C-alpha cells in the first residue's frame, strides 16, 4: 500500500550532470591512465601528420 | 627564535626548489625510457596530435 | 590592473551567479572555504578581476546580492560555494517581490536601492581601475527586472565611464513562467536600451535545445542549464584574467562589437560541446570549434541567424592553438555565409585567443553575436505586449502601485523604435 | 617600573574591572589562580606584566587595583567566582549599606567609614609602586557609589597625590535610555566637583555601545558582559604602549597633554575599531586606512554624540598590531583632506599617534581575532549638546524640587544644587567659547 | 527519511576557534546537510555527496565534507545512537612478537572477517608499559616469561570496529591455549598461526571495560605510547603510504604479503588520519611537476592512510622498481609483477607511494614517523 | 492541572493554601549569575591554535 | 550583611505573611521542618535577610506574628509551613479585635504593644546592619489598622533611620466585607501619611480580577490572592538577597521612587501571570513581560492607571535576560504612552535586574508604581467616610473606647490634604 509509485527520472539538482558532460572523455581516460597506441601509428603521425 | 623560525621557512623553501628540480629531471628521464621500451615492445604513448 | 563587480538580482540571477562563482572558483583554484588551493602559479595571475582578499589569503568574491525575498539568500548561503561571500553584501529585505516591475521599481524595490548603492559604492571605491559591472538577472518577472533596471540607472549615473555587462534571461516563445513577462520585458529593455553598454540575451529554449541536440541529456535541471551560462560568463572575461596572444577585455569587445550605441544586444555561445557518447568520436580542432559556433543549434538566444544579417561576431578562444587556422577559419565563415554577413562592415569578425583552456577541456571558445536576428525576440515581445495592452489587462497593479499610463506607451514606442534600426540595417 | 593603579567604584566600576582583569590575565598569560604556567613569552617576561600585576615569592601575580563598592554582593560575586584566588581579600573593599543612588549618601554621610580604609589600601599599593604613572578611575555618573565615592576620592587623591595623573573612564548618562531618575542630579553634582580634580576623563556611553553591538557585532540579545567587555578592549588599547614595545611609545602622561587643551575642558570621546563578530571579519580587508576611517565614521563612536554637530579639538590614535606607520600617514592624511572632519582653526596639528607591536588578544567571547586595531579618543565640542541636554533635564527636574528632600536631609546643603547648575552653565559657556573660529 | 544526525567539529584556519556543527546524513539518496549550532541557522543545504559513504560515519572519524575535514564528536540525537550504536564496537588487537612478520595475513584475515580498522601502530613494550598489560595475569608464576615475550620483539597493534566486535573477534581468535586450539582444529588464528600457550597469536580483551583499559594503556588520549620502532636512519629508509582507497577496499593485507615475500622487510607502520595542511606539506614537492596534483592530494586527506618504512635488502630490484611505474595501466603494460601493476588503478589510486628520490627517503620517514607524532 | 483542588472530593478543606505551589513549571533553575558564568569561560570553552602547519623540516 | 525585619498584623496579615513565608521557604530551600535541603549555594549565601541562624541547621524565619484573636495563629501553626516559626514570636492576646480602630489603637492593643516591642527589639539587636521593617496588614478592619498604625508609630520612634514598607489591603468598591472600612481606612491613612516611607496599596477586587482573567481560575481562593501579593512582596526584596548586576534594594527604590515625602503610596504589579493551560505556549520574553506589566489589567489596586499620569515607575526584573531588550522596551512604552507620564520629571523609570528568577519561572518583573491615579482610591474612601460621618453613625463605639470626636475631622482633613498634591501634580 505505501511505496513510491511512478516512473523515476534520475536527475541531479546542483549540476553534476552538466559538470560531467562538460569534461572531455579524453581527459577522463588520461586521468584513468596514459593512452597507448601502436608504434607505427606513432611513426606515421610523427612523419606525415 | 623569531629569526630562527624565519630561517626554517627559508630552508624549507630551498629544499623545496632543489627537490622539485630533481623530481622533474627524474620524471622526464623515466618518461623517455618508458617510451623507449614501449617502442621496443611494439606500442607507444598517445600525444595530442603526435 | 582591472576589476569587475558582480551584481546579481532576482532568484534567477542569484542562482545563475552562484553557479558562476562555483565555476570561477573551480577555474581559479579557490575551495569552498575560500583558501587558495590551485596547481599553477598562473591561476593567481589576475585574481583581482573577481575576488577581493581578506586576512590570511582568503579570497571573498566582489559580488553584491539583492532580492525582495529572503529565501533565495538562504539558498545561496546554504549552497556548496556559499560560505565564501561577504555577509554584509547579502543585501536582503523583508518584503515581497511579486514579479511586478512596479513593485520592484517605484516602491519597496526602490526602498532598498540606497543600501544596495552603498554596498556597490564601497566595492567600487575599493578599487583603482574598475572596468565595470556585470549584473545577472531575469528580463521577465520582478526584482531582476524591477530593481535591476533601477540599479543599472543609478550605477550608470554614478560611474559613466565603465562597461555595463548585463547577463539577462529573456522570455521564451514556447513557454512562459510568468503571465506578465511581456510587460516586464518591455519595461526592462526600455531602460536597457539607454543605460547598459552590452547585454547578453540568454533564452531558455535555445539554452536547452543545446541539451538535446548536442549534449543528448535526458533530464537536465536548472543546475545543469545555468552551467552553460556560467561557461559563457567565464569565457567572455578570460583574456583579462589569463594571459594569451592578442588579448581582449570587455571594453575592447564592446568597441569592436557595438557599432551603434542602441544596438548592443548579443547572443552568446560556447562550443566545445558534444554528448557523452559522442565525446570519443569527435575531432576537437579549431575548424570544428568554429563550425560549432556558427551552427544554429548551439546558441542560447532563440534567434535564427538565417533570419537576419550578422552585424558583428566576436570569438574569444581559450587553449593552445595556431593563429593561421583561426584567421582562415573565420575568413572562410565570412566567405561561405556571405549573404548573411553585412557588407558595410568588411571583416565583421573580431577574433581573440587565450593560452590556458578551462580545466577538463583542451580547447574552448566563447561566441558573441550581434545580428538583426534579435528583432524576432523584440518583435515577439512587442506583439505580446500589444496583445495584453489593448485590453488593459494585468495593469491595475501597476497603476495602484504607482505607475502611469503614458510611459507604457513610451516603453512600447521605444521597443518599436529599437525594432526600426535593426530592420533598416538589415537592408542597409 | 612603569605601572599604574586601577581604581574601580560601584557595580559598574567593579565589573568594568572583572572583565578588564580577565582580559589582562589572558593578555599576560596569567592563570585565574594567580600564577603563570611558564615564562619566555612576549606577554609575560617582566616589563609588560609589571605594569599591572605585581610579583610574589610563590609565583603569585597580585593585582594593582582597588575594587571598592559601598554595598556587598558584587564584590561578593567577584570573590565567589573564578577569580577568587587572584584578587587579594583586602584588595576588594565592600561596605555594608547601599548608596541608594544618592550623591549625598555617596559623598557626605556614608563615605567616612570607608574613605580611610580605601586611602590606606591606595597608600599601600603606591608604596609598592616604583614609578607610578597614574590612577585609572572606572565609575559611572549614575548610581550613588560611582557618583559620590569617586567625588570624595578625587578630592582626597588631589590632597595627597596632587601632581599625579588621573584618567577617568566614565559611564556618562545616555541621551535617551537611562537607568534612573536621579541620574540628572548625580551626574551634574559629580562632574561639578570632579571637574577641577580630574586630569582627563574619557566618557563612554551605553546606548552607543548598544548600537555598536547591534550593528557590527551582529548580536540582537546581548548583556552587560558584551557591553563592557569592549570598554576592557578600550583600556587595553590605552594602557598598553607602556606594557609592550612599538614604533611610537605613547605614555599615560601624554594623553592628558595631547587631549586636554584647557583646564576645565578635559572630556574626550572614545571609539574603537575592529568591532566585527568573527564570522564577518574575514571577508573584509581591515587595512589601516579602513580601520582609521571606521573610527571617524559617525556611527562607531562609543558615546551617542554626533561629530558633525561640532568641531574636533584634539584626536589621539592608538594603533595596535602589525600596523605600518606609512599606511598610518596615508590614512591620517586622507581623513584630514575631506570636509566632514572639521577641525578648529587653533590646532592644525590635531593628531597623536601611538603604535604598539602587540596584536590584540581575543577573549573567549564575541569579538573577532584581529591583527590590527585602533582606539581613537577625540576631544570635541560636540559633547556640549549632551551637556546642555543634561542641564535641561536638571532644570526640568529642579524647577519644582523633585527628590530634593532625600539629598538635603542626608547632610548636603541646598546651595550645592544651585552651585553645580551654574558650574554647568560655565562649562557650556566655555564649550561655546572654544567653538567659533579666530577673527582677531 | 532515515536521518543519521551527528555532532561534527571543524578547525577554521583563519578563525582560530573550534567551530561546532551538526551533520545530517540521508543514506536514502545519499545526501549531507550541516547545521550551525551557535547562531542556529542552515549550513550546506541537503545535497548529494557520494564521496561520503555510510561506513565511514564513526565517532572519531575525520570525514571530508566540502573542503572541510570534519572530525566526529558525539551521537547527539539518540535515534542514531540506538541504530548505529551497538552495530559498531571497540576492539583492541595485539599481534604478538611471534608471527609479527606474518602480520600481513593477520591483517588480511581481520579485514576478511568484516572488520574496519581505525588506527594501527607497531612499537616495542617498555618496562612500565609492559607491566601495565599484565594486571589480569598478576600473581601467577608465568609473569617473567610473559615479560620476556612482550619485550622480545616488535608488536603491531590495531583498533577494530564491527557489530559484536569483541565476541566475534574472540570467535576468530579461538581458545586461549593454542595447544587446545590445535586439538580442536577450528582454523582459528592460534590454531593455524601459533606455537604454544605462552606464544599464541595475539591477546584481546574479554569485556568492554577490558577493551577500554587496554586501549588506554595502549593508544592513549595523552600522547605517550611507545618508541614506535624505526631504527630511524639505517642508510636506506624509503617509505610507503598505503592509501585510503587500498585500506577501504581491504588490499592492505595483500600489500603486506607482497612486500614481505619480496626480500623487503617492514619495520615501522603507523595509520594516521591526516589533515590538509600536513598533506599539502608532504605533497608540496608535487606542485607543478605532475599535472594532476589537487585530486591526488584530496585522496591523501580523504580517509585513513598507513605509513610504513621498508629496509632495502632485495638485490637488483629496489623499492622503486618493486613499486613500479606511477601509472598502473602503464605498469600493467610494463613489468606485471609490481605493486602498482597488480594492486592499483586510475593513477591516483595507486596502492603504494614510494619515495621517488633515492637519497631522500629518510626525510619522509622522519616526517610520517617522527615530526607528525 | 492544579495541586490543591478546592472542588476536589476531600472532606477537609483548609481555605488558606493556594491552589498551586509554584507559579510556573520550569525544570532548570540555573542558579548561576552572569559575572559567575560569563567570567568562567577561561577555565573552560578553550580553543587555541592547535592545528598548526607542521614544517617538513 | 543586611536583613529585613518582617512583621504582620491581623488575621489578613497572618495569612498574607504565612503565604509570603511559604514562597520564601520554597525559594531558599527550606522544608516544613526547617532544615535546608536545596541544590545550590547561591540561595544559602544570603538567607540571613529573612532567616536567623540557629544550631543544627535549623534556620528560623525572623517574623513578628501579631493579632488580637488567637485563632488565626492556630491556623498558621497548623498550616503547611506551620512548624517553622519561633514559638515566642506568636504574640497572642485572649481578646477580640472588635473591628474597631479605637479598640486597635487606644485599648488593650496598647497593653500588648509593649510585649510586641520587646519581641521586635529582641529580633532587632540580634543583627549587625538592619535595612528596616516590613509590615503587612489590612486597612479595612481591626487589629492591623489600629494596632498596625500604633506599632508603626512606636517602632518608627524607636528606630528613625530604617526604612518602612507597609503592604496594606485597602478596601474595595464592588464589595464591602465589613461596615467600618471607611472609619478604619481613614484612621489608618492618617498615620500612614507621616510615618511609613513606602506603602504599596493592594486592593482585593483587583486580585480577583487578575486571578479570574489572567490566571483564568474559576473559584480563586484567598491562598491564590495571597500568593500573588506574596510574589510581589518577594520580588521587591530580591537584589538585596540574590546576586545579580545592577542590584537595587528598598532604600534605593524609595529614593528613586518618591519625589515628595508624602507621595509614598505605590501601586504594585507582578507580571509573568500567564495561565498554566497556555503556559507551554507562551513565548515568555522581555516585551511580553513589559506588555503584561504595563497594561491596566495586572494592577493590584482597584484603580485605573489611565485615569491619572504615572509619577514614577519601577521594574525589578529577574532572570537571565538581555538589557538591550529591557530598556529599549522601557523607552518603547515610555515614548508610546507619553500622555500617561508627567512631563516635569524626565526618564521616570527604574531598571533593576537580578540574575536569578523565582523558581518555577525563568523571567519575571515586579512593578512598583507611584501614580496620580491613586487619587481615586482615596476619593472613594473620602466620600464613603463623609457619607456616614455626617450623621454620626457607627461612631459611639469609637468615642466610647476613649477617642475624641474631632480626630475624625482631623483624619479627613489630613486625607484630603494628601488628596491635594497628588491631584495638582497630575495636571501640572
Ligand atoms: N558592563 C557593565 N556596565 C554597567 C553595569 N552595571 C551598570 N552599568 C552602567 O552603570 C550605570 C549604573 O551603575 P552604578 O552607578 O554603578 O550603580 P551604583 O553606583 O551601584 O548605584 P546603586 O547600587 O543603585 O546605589 C548604569 O547606567 C549602566 O549604564 C554592569 O554590570 N556591567
Ligand atoms: N538559467 C537559469 N534560469 C533560471 C534559473 N532560475 C530561474 N530561471 C529563469 O528565471 C525566470 C523567472 O525569474 P523571476 O521570476 O523574475 O525571478 P525573481 O526576480 O526572483 O522574481 C524563469 O523564466 C526561469 O526560466 C536558473 O537557475 N538558471
Ligand atoms: N489577599 C488576602 N486578603 C485577605 C486574606 N484574609 C483576609 N483578607 C481580606 O481582609 C479583609 C478583612 O480582614 P480584616 O477584618 O481587616 O482582618 P482583621 O483586622 O484581623 O479583623 C477581607 O475583605 C479579606 O478580603 C488573605 O489571606 N489574603
UniProtKB/TrEMBL annotation, chain B:
Transmembrane segments: none annotated. It comes from the Eukaryota. GO terms for biological process: flagellated sperm motility. One of its GO terms (cellular component) is axonemal A tubule inner sheath. This is Cilia and flagella associated protein 141. It comes from Sus scrofa (Pig). The chain holds residues 52 to 101 of 101 of the full protein.
From TrEMBL, chains C, G:
Its main location: cytoplasm. Residues 47-244 form the Tubulin/FtsZ GTPase domain. Keywords: Cytoplasm, Cytoskeleton, GTP-binding, Isopeptide bond, Magnesium, Metal-binding, Methylation, Microtubule, Nucleotide-binding, Ubl conjugation. Residues 246-383 form the Tubulin/FtsZ 2-layer sandwich domain. Coiled coil: none annotated. Dimer of alpha and beta chains. A typical microtubule is a hollow water-filled tube with an outer diameter of 25 nm and an inner diameter of 15 nM. Alpha-beta heterodimers associate head-to-tail to form protofilaments running lengthwise along the microtubule wall with the beta-tubulin subunit facing the microtubule plus end conferring a structural polarity. Microtubules usually have 13 protofilaments but different protofilament numbers can be found in some organisms and specialized cells. Belongs to the tubulin family. This is Tubulin beta chain.
UniProtKB/TrEMBL annotation, chain D:
Transmembrane segments: none annotated. It is found in: Cytoplasm, Cytoskeleton. GO terms for biological process: microtubule cytoskeleton organization; mitotic cell cycle. Residues 49-246 form the Tubulin/FtsZ GTPase domain. CDD domains: alpha_tubulin (cd02186). GO terms for cellular component: cytoplasm; microtubule. Its cofactor is Mg(2+). GO terms for molecular function: GTP binding; hydrolase activity; structural constituent of cytoskeleton. PROSITE patterns: TUBULIN. Its main location: cytoplasm. Dimer of alpha and beta chains. A typical microtubule is a hollow water-filled tube with an outer diameter of 25 nm and an inner diameter of 15 nM. Alpha-beta heterodimers associate head-to-tail to form protofilaments running lengthwise along the microtubule wall with the beta-tubulin subunit facing the microtubule plus end conferring a structural polarity. Microtubules usually have 13 protofilaments but different protofilament numbers can be found in some organisms and specialized cells. Heterodimer of alpha- and beta-tubulin. A typical microtubule is a hollow water-filled tube with an outer diameter of 25 nm and an inner diameter of 15 nM. Alpha-beta heterodimers associate head-to-tail to form protofilaments running lengthwise along the microtubule wall with the beta-tubulin subunit facing the microtubule plus end conferring a structural polarity. Microtubules usually have 13 protofilaments but different protofilament numbers can be found in some organisms and specialized cells. This is Tubulin alpha chain.
From TrEMBL, chain E:
GO terms for cellular component: axonemal A tubule inner sheath; centrosome; ciliary basal body; cytosol; extracellular region; gamma-tubulin ring complex; nucleoplasm; plasma membrane. The active site is at 203 (pros-phosphohistidine intermediate). It comes from the Eukaryota. SUPFAM superfamilies: Nucleoside diphosphate kinase, NDK. Keywords: ATP-binding, Cell projection, Cilium, Cytoplasm, Cytoskeleton, Flagellum, Hydrolase, Kinase, Nucleotide-binding, Nucleus, Transferase. The keyword Glycoprotein does not apply. GO terms for biological process: brain development; cellular response to leukemia inhibitory factor; cilium assembly; CTP biosynthetic process; determination of left/right symmetry; DNA catabolic process; epithelial cilium movement involved in extracellular fluid movement; flagellated sperm motility. One of its GO terms (molecular function) is protein kinase activity. It is found in: Cytoplasm, Cytoskeleton, Flagellum axoneme; Cytoplasm, Cytoskeleton, Microtubule organizing center, Centrosome; Cytoplasm, Cytoskeleton, Spindle; Nucleus. Residues 1-88 form the DM10 domain. Belongs to the NDK family. Component of sperm flagellar doublet microtubules. Component of the gamma-tubulin ring complex. This is Nucleoside diphosphate kinase homolog 7.
Amino acid at each position: 500500500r505505501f511505496n513510491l509509485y511512478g516512473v523515476p527520472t534520475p536527475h541531479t539538482n546542483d549540476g553534476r550532470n552538466m559538470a560531467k558532460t562538460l569534461h572531455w572523455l579524453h581527459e577522463l581516460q588520461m586521468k584513468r591512465g596514459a593512452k597507448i597506441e601502436s608504434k607505427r601509428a606513432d611513426d606515421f603521425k610523427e612523419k606525415f601528420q | 627564535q623569531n629569526t630562527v623560525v624565519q630561517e626554517l621557512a627559508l630552508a624549507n623553501k630551498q629544499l623545496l626548489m632543489v627537490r622539485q628540480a630533481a623530481l622533474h629531471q627524474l620524471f622526464e628521464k623515466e618518461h623517455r625510457q618508458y617510451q623507449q621500451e614501449l617502442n621496443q615492445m611494439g606500442k607507444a604513448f598517445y600525444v595530442e596530435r603526435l | 590592473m582591472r576589476e569587475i563587480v558582480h551584481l546579481q538580482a532576482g532568484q534567477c540571477g542569484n542562482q545563475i551567479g552562484a553557479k558562476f562563482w562555483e565555476v570561477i572558483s573551480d577555474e581559479h583554484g579557490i575551495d569552498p572555504t575560500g583558501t587558495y588551493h590551485g596547481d599553477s602559479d598562473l591561476q593567481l595571475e589576475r585574481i583581482n578581476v573577481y575576488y577581493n582578499e581578506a586576512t590570511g589569503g582568503k579570497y571573498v568574491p566582489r559580488a553584491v546580492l539583492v532580492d525582495l525575498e529572503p529565501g533565495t539568500m538562504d539558498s545561496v548561503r546554504s549552497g556548496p560555494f556559499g560560505q565564501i561571500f561577504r555577509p554584509d553584501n547579502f543585501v536582503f529585505g523583508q518584503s515581497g517581490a511579486g514579479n511586478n516591475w512596479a513593485k520592484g521599481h517605484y516602491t519597496e524595490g526602490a526602498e532598498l536601492v540606497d543600501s544596495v548603492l552603498d554596498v556597490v559604492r564601497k566595492e567600487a571605491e575599493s578599487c583603482d581601475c574598475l572596468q565595470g559591472f556585470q549584473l545577472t538577472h531575469s528580463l521577465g518577472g520582478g526584482t531582476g527586472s524591477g530593481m535591476g533596471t533601477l540599479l543599472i540607472s543609478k550605477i550608470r549615473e554614478e560611474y559613466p565611464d565603465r562597461i555595463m555587462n548585463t547577463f539577462s534571461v529573456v522570455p521564451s516563445p514556447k513557454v512562459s513562467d510568468t503571465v506578465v513577462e511581456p510587460y516586464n520585458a518591455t519595461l526592462s529593455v526600455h531602460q536597457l536600451v539607454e543605460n547598459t553598454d552590452e547585454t547578453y540575451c540568454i533564452d531558455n529554449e535555445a539554452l536547452y535545445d543545446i541539451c538535446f541536440r548536442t549534449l543528448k541529456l535526458t533530464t537536465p535541471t536548472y543546475g545543469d542549464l545555468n552551467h552553460l551560462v556560467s561557461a559563457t560568463m567565464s569565457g567572455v572575461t578570460t583574456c583579462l584574467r589569463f594571459p594569451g596572444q592578442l588579448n581582449a577585455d570587455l571594453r575592447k569587445l564592446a568597441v569592436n562589437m557595438v557599432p551603434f550605441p542602441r544596438l548592443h544586444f548579443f547572443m552568446p555561445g560556447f562550443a566545445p560541446l558534444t554528448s557523452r557518447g559522442s565525446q570519443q568520436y569527435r575531432a576537437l580542432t579549431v575548424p570544428e570549434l568554429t563550425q560549432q559556433m556558427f551552427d544554429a543549434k548551439n546558441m542560447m538566444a532563440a534567434c535564427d541567424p538565417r533570419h537576419g544579417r550578422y552585424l558583428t561576431v566576436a570569438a574569444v578562444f581559450r587553449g593552445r592553438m595556431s593563429m593561421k587556422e583561426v584567421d582562415e577559419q573565420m575568413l572562410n565563415v565570412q566567405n561561405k555565409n556571405s549573404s548573411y554577413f553585412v557588407e558595410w562592415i568588411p571583416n565583421n569578425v573580431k577574433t581573440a585567443v587565450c593560452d590556458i583552456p578551462p580545466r577538463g577541456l583542451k580547447m574552448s571558445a566563447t561566441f558573441i553575436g550581434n545580428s538583426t536576428a534579435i528583432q524576432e525576440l523584440f518583435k515577439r515581445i512587442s506583439e505580446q505586449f500589444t496583445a495584453m495592452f489593448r485590453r488593459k489587462a494585468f495593469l491595475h497593479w501597476y497603476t495602484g502601485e504607482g505607475m502611469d499610463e503614458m510611459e507604457f506607451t513610451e516603453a512600447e514606442s521605444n521597443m518599436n523604435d529599437l525594432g526600426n534600426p535593426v530592420v533598416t540595417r538589415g537592408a542597409c | 617600573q612603569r605601572e599604574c593603579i586601577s581604581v574601580h567604584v560601584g557595580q559598574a566600576g567593579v565589573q568594568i574591572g572583572n572583565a578588564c582583569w580577565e582580559l589582562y590575565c589572558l593578555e599576560h598569560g596569567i592563570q585565574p589562580d594567580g600564577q603563570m604556567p611558564s615564562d619566555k613569552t612576549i606577554g609575560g617576561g617582566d616589563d609588560s606584566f609589571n605594569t599591572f600585576f605585581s610579583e610574589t615569592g610563590a609565583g603569585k601575580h597580585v593585582p594593582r587595583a582597588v575594587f571598592v563598592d559601598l554595598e556587598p554582593t558584587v564584590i561578593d560575586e567577584v570573590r565567589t567566582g573564578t577569580y577568587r584566588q587572584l584578587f587579594h581579600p583586602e584588595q576588594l573593599i565592600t561596605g555594608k549599606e547601599d548608596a541608594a543612588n544618592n550623591y549625598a549618601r555617596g559623598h557626605y554621610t556614608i563615605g567616612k567609614e570607608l574613605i580611610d580604609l580605601v586611602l590606606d589600601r591606595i597608600r599601600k599599593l603606591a608604596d609598592q609602586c616604583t614609578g607610578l604613572q597614574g590612577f585609572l578611575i572606572f565609575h559611572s555618573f549614575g548610581g550613588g557609589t560611582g557618583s559620590g565615592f569617586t567625588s570624595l576620592l578625587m578630592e582626597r587623591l588631589s590632597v595627597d597625590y596632587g601632581k599625579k595623573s588621573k584618567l577617568e573612564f566614565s559611564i556618562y548618562p545616555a541621551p535617551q535610555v537611562s537607568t534612573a531618575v536621579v541620574e540628572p542630579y548625580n551626574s551634574i553634582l559629580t562632574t561639578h566637583t570632579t571637574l577641577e580634580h580630574s586630569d582627563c576623563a574619557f566618557m563612554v556611553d551605553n546606548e552607543a555601545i548598544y548600537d555598536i553591538c547591534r550593528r557590527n557585532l551582529d548580536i540582537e540579545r546581548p548583556t552587560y558582559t558584551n557591553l563592557n567587555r569592549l570598554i576592557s578592549q578600550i583600556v587595553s588599547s590605552i594602557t598598553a604602549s607602556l606594557r609592550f614595545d612599538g614604533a611610537l611609545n605613547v605614555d599615560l602622561t601624554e594623553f592628558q597633554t595631547n587631549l586636554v587643551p584647557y583646564p576645565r575642558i578635559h572630556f574626550p570621546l572614545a571609539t574603537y575599531a575592529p568591532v566585527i563578530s568573527a564570522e564577518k571579519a574575514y571577508h573584509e580587508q581591515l587595512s589601516v586606512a579602513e580601520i582609521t576611517n571606521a573610527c571617524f565614521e559617525p556611527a562607531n563612536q562609543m558615546v551617542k554624540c554626533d561629530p558633525r554637530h561640532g568641531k574636533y579639538m584634539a584626536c589621539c590614535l592608538l594603533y595596535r598590531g602589525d600596523v605600518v606607520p606609512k599606511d598610518v600617514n596615508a590614512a591620517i592624511a586622507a581623513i584630514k583632506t575631506k570636509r566632514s572632519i572639521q577641525f578648529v582653526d587653533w590646532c592644525p596639528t590635531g593628531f597623536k599617534v601611538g603604535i604598539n607591536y602587540q596584536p590584540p588578544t581575543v577573549v573567549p567571547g564575541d569579538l573577532a581575532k584581529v591583527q590590527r586595531a585602533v582606539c581613537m579618543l577625540s576631544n570635541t565640542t560636540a559633547i556640549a549638546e549632551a551637556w546642555a541636554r543634561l542641564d535641561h533635564k536638571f532644570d526640568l527636574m529642579y524647577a519644582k524640587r523633585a527628590f530634593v528632600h532625600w539629598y538635603v536631609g542626608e547632610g548636603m546643603e541646598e546651595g550645592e544644587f544651585s552651585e553645580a547648575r551654574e558650574d554647568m552653565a560655565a562649562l557650556e559657556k566655555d564649550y561655546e567659547e572654544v567653538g567659533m573660529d579666530s577673527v582677531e | 527519511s532515515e536521518r543519521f544526525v551527528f555532532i561534527a567539529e571543524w578547525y577554521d584556519p583563519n578563525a582560530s576557534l573550534f567551530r561546532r556543527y551538526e551533520l545530517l546524513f540521508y543514506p536514502g539518496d545519499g545526501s549531507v546537510e550541516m547545521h550551525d549550532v551557535k547562531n542556529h541557522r542552515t549550513f550546506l543545504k541537503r545535497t548529494k555527496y557520494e564521496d561520503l559513504h555510510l561506513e565511514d560515519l564513526f565517532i572519531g572519524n575525520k570525514v571530508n565534507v566540502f573542503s572541510r575535514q570534519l572530525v566526529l564528536i558525539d551521537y547527539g540525537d539518540q535515534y542514531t545512537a540506538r541504530q548505529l550504536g551497538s552495530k559498531k564496537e571497540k576492539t583492541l588487537a595485539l599481534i604478538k612478537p611471534d608471527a609479527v612478520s606474518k602480520a600481513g595475513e593477520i591483517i588480511e584475515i581481520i579485514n576478511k572477517a568484516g572488520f574496519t580498522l581505525t588506527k594501527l601502530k607497531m612499537m616495542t613494550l617498555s618496562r612500565k608499559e609492559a607491566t601495565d598489560f599484565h594486571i589480569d595475569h598478576q600473581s601467577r608464576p608465568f609473569l617473567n616469561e610473559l615479560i620476556q615475550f612482550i619485550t622480545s620483539g616488535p608488536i603491531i597493534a590495531m583498533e577494530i570496529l564491527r557489530d559484536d566486535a569483541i565476541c566475534e573477534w574472540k570467535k576468530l581468535l579461538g581458545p586461549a591455549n593454542s595447544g587446545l586450539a590445535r586439538t580442536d582444529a577450528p582454523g582459528s588464528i592460534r590454531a593455524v598461526f601459533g606455537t604454544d600457550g605462552i606464544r599464541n597469536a595475539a591477546h584481546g580483551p574479554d569485556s568492554l571495560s577490558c577493551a577500554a583499559r587496554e586501549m588506554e594503556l595502549f593508544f592513549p588520549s595523552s600522547g605517550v605510547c611507545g618508541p614506535a620502532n624505526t631504527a630511524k636512519f639505517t642508510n636506506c629508509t624509503t617509505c610507503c603510504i598505503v592509501k585510503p582507497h587500498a585500506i577501504s577496499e581491504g588490499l592492505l593485507g595483500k600489500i603486506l604479503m607482497a612486500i614481505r615475500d619480496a626480500g623487503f622487510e617492514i619495520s615501522a607502520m603507523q595509520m594516521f588520519n591526516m589533515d590538509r595542511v600536513n598533506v599539502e606539506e608532504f605533497y608540496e614537492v608535487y606542485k607543478g611537476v605532475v599535472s594532476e596534483y589537487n585530486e591526488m592530494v584530496t585522496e591523501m586527506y580523504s580517509g585513513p592512510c598507513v605509513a610504513m618504512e621498508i629496509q632495502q635488502t632485495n638485490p637488483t630490484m629496489t623499492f622503486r622498481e618493486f613499486c613500479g611505474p606511477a601509472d598502473p595501466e602503464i605498469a600493467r603494460h610494463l613489468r606485471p609483477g609490481t605493486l602498482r601493476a597488480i594492486f592499483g588503478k586510475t593513477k591516483i589510486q595507486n596502492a603504494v607511494h614510494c619515495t621517488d628520490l633515492p637519497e631522500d627517503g629518510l626525510l619522509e620517514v622522519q616526517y610520517f614517523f617522527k615530526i607528525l607524532d | 492541572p492544579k495541586d490543591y483542588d478546592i472542588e476536589g472530593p476531600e472532606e477537609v478543606k483548609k481555605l488558606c493554601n493556594s491552589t498551586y505551589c509554584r507559579l510556573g513549571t520550569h525544570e532548570p533553575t540555573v542558579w548561576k549569575s552572569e559575572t559567575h558564568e560569563k567570567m568562567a569561560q577561561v577555565y573552560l570553552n578553550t580553543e587555541f591554535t592547535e592545528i598548526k602547519s607542521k614544517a617538513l623540516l
